[PDB]
Amino acid sequence: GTSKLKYVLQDARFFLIKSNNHENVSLAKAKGVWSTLPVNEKKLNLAFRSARSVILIFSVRESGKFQGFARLSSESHHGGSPIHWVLPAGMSAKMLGGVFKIDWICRRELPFTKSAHLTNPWNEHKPVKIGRDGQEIELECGTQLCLLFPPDESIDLYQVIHKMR
Numbered sequence: 001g002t003s004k005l006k007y008v009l010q011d012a013r014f015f016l017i018k019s020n021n022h023e024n025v026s027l028a029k030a031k032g033v034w035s036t037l038p039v040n041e042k043k044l045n046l047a048f049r050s051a052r053s054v055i056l057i058f059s060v061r062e063s064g065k066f067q068g069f070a071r072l073s074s075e076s077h078h079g080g081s082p083i084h085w086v087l088p089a090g091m092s093a094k095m096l097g098g099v100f101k102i103d104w105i106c107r108r109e110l111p112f113t114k115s116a117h118l119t120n121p122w123n124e125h126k127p128v129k130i131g132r133d134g135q136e137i138e139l140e141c142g143t144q145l146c147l148l149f150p151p152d153e154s155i156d157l158y159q160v161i162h163k164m165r
Ligand SMILES: CC1=NC(=O)[C@H](C(=O)NCCNS(C)(=O)=O)C=C1
Pocket: 018, 019, 020, 021, 024, 034, 035, 036, 037, 085, 086, 087, 088, 091, 133
């Protein structure tokens, strides 16, 4: 069912995350981490203190799909074990901000064709698939987008609900 999912998403904030490739999303799914450029890191840290859940919705460039969504479990931190991201040409590891711990809520994909009826007011009401890395998605659009994903029966949201407290 979808009731615990709706509870997690209640009054959440949502951010679109772009990855240059699938390798980085695979690493994020395996290790429960993400790192973004400092401009976006600042927004995510602010949002983490402001809302019960901050949701990252991932899309690999040119894939025509979203690859899942996850909830921030911490603000960003530095000085951990190096994650071997396969970074875009022109982006060094030193250019990234810190590392956010994340809990995956859905590891299933959603094709852009299924979200064509959703627009993001914070990006000029363009289709939600359209947007820059780090773009905030307004509450109602973000909630409906997350609810379109196929259910991920491998995930138990009981563990995430207790972190919201
Ligand atoms: C860890 C990681 N973080 C990212 O943020 C990545 C990205 O592809 N971001 C959007 C492109 N940014 S850029 C400066 O235009 O090339 C990829 C890996």
